[PDB]
Symmetry: C3
């Protein structure tokens, strides 16, 4: 019936506070959702778990017997990353073979060299029911496994007690 005042329409039309722009609505429609933010956080967690499993998995290398020794059991060094070092756990049993039963029976790779300034000394069992058949084994700074004393040169010697850490070297 009655007509609207131009002033009232004008004030409404010029009230920018109660209207929007087309570009505003595109901006707001594109904002992140709670489900999208949670998916990204879930993926960060999954990536973290995968990185941890990778970092903490056990690695292995096979060692070749030297100086006439034989690998009566396969000579295997297993190792685990801890920070920028490795924990190295040797395994296997060496036999006299054609050598003397003494001396260097195997050498580990250079990246498994021990953190040490001279030989490290290990007590090892020999494969024997006589408890006097044990060994004094040196692990050298270049990672030679050097059998220095044995109860008997004719009895096999175990390497399963040789465990050590490497130097602080980025990897």
């Amino acid at each position: 019936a009655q007509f609207a005042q131009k002033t009232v329409l004008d004030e409404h039309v010029n009230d920018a506070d109660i209207h929007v722009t087309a570009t505003d609505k595109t901006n707001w429609n594109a904002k992140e959702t709670v489900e999208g933010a949670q998916a990204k956080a879930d993926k960060a967690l999954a990536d973290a778990k995968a990185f941890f499993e990778l970092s903490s998995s056990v690695q292995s290398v096979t060692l070749t017997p030297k100086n006439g020794f034989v690998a009566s059991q396969p000579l295997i060094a297993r190792y685990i990353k801890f920070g920028n070092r490795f924990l190295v756990i040797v395994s296997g049993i060496v036999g006299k073979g054609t050598g003397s039963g003494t001396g260097i029976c195997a050498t580990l790779p250079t990246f498994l060299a021990p953190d040490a300034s001279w030989n490290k000394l290990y007590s090892a069992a020999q494969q024997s029911t006589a408890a006097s058949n044990q060994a004094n084994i040196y692990l050298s700074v270049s990672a030679d496994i050097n059998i220095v004393g044995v109860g008997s040169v004719d009895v096999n010697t175990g390497l399963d007690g040789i465990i050590y850490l490497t130097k602080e070297v980025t990897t």
Copy 2:
């Protein structure tokens, strides 16, 4: 003169670009906030740290002495997960008890069997000031701890030096 033109009111009411809908406002009010996204990221970080602490925690089991041996100190196998295997660290001291002082003194759980194709060999101390009282221990592929030779059957034998990686 002072009245508003119908053409002007009509163009305004049909400018959908500058107006919204109830559905728009519900959608926009429900969008993620900066603190809400940060809370979710913070929770992911806390969950990662908790998962790491759990995955690297030590588990323990007290072992049953076998073949007449006694647990002069409790025989405990402690173990840590690494990837798809465990690092196992045995502890305790066995006494002769009603047995001979040699043979299988304990067997670890099957899932802690060593990664090996034959026995693993360990030198062990006995509980003695005589250094000839030591022991040769074989850890079998079925995780038997077999004291195969000792300096003296009448002296206790330690298990604290047995450490190894399992299979799988």
Copy 3:
């Protein structure tokens, strides 16, 4: 006729559902972006990796020889956190020095005390070609390294095989 009806203007002006407020618009402009949420997730991943790498790094402490023994090679305990415990890996070689060749040659720090109710028993190599020159070592509950028996008191004794877990703390 050509003029706008006051009822139609009034109805539009009173339709709050199709209009907004200044506060609405600040609320929506402040909302998180896909890029911003992804940056926060990326930082959570980077922080997790940094925490893991630090947490699993090896720590070291040098031990002082006691009771007249000497350190022919430095006595160093290296240790790794595993949950609420530590794995301790001892290293070094002790000599008789001015002592007797037996007894407590070194004590580890209190926070590296072993999880044990009595001594833990270790066989150690001596620096000798005679395999009868080995040692029985007791690690006490107070973390004393006690050389209880040796084949020869005049030959050095290695500590490189002593590995153990601490208590839950």
